[PDB]
Amino acid sequence: IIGGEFTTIENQPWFAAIYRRHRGGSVTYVCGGSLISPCWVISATHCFIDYPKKEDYIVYLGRSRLNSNTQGEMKFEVENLILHKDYSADTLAHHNDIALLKIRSKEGRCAQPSRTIQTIALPSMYNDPQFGTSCEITGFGKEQSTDYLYPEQLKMTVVKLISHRECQQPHYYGSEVTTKMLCAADPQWKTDSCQGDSGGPLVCSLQGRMTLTGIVSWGRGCALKDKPGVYTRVSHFLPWIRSHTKE
């Protein structure tokens, strides 16, 4: 996250920190995600497409730091890693950039809600906040596009939704953004998501509920003028999410 504020997991308790184990046994961060039910984390397919084997991944819930353990965290293996079969990218745009991770602890349990772990509600079919709405994004992504290190403490910031009309202007992204995506950014272009924040939530209050409106997906640079974050539009993926999470 560029700009914004350091936070703690209790302020974003649906935030999932996803890591991959390497031959040798070193573990590095991959991407963010969101807990949408006790056994289910949603994230972005681009985060996994290079290494699509579920056995490589670890998911932490209730974790506030990147490379350090925090009290109240819980660790899960990935029982099912579901990538969108129609994922594609161009130079910039990612389509169908949505992934599901079924989580299970070694003791065979799904998440249990606590002061540091809560699910986030999904929106109703095609239900989104009106543009101009202020939303939150959170992650362990770079704090400046030019940095090589990632913050060790979780960050969050506020960004406002941008209309399709404005986002589809040529000096923005033009026809790169579809109805299956949402744009969001700071009016002054000072705060944004960045590398490392992919797969994490764009959370909005909608019909008076904290809702997962978007998933951090793509954008040109980070915190550049007229170049908003682009987010997978969750309310337009309810059938995909439904048909892949049945019990």
């Binding site: 590095t28 991407c31 992504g141 770079k142 990632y150 490392g196 924040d197 040109r220 640079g221």
Partner: peptide, 16 residues
Amino acid sequence: CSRYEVDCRGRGGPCG
């Protein structure tokens, strides 16, 4: 760029 890259296809990443 290497096997340890974080979010290598994310915004501003080598393959983003």
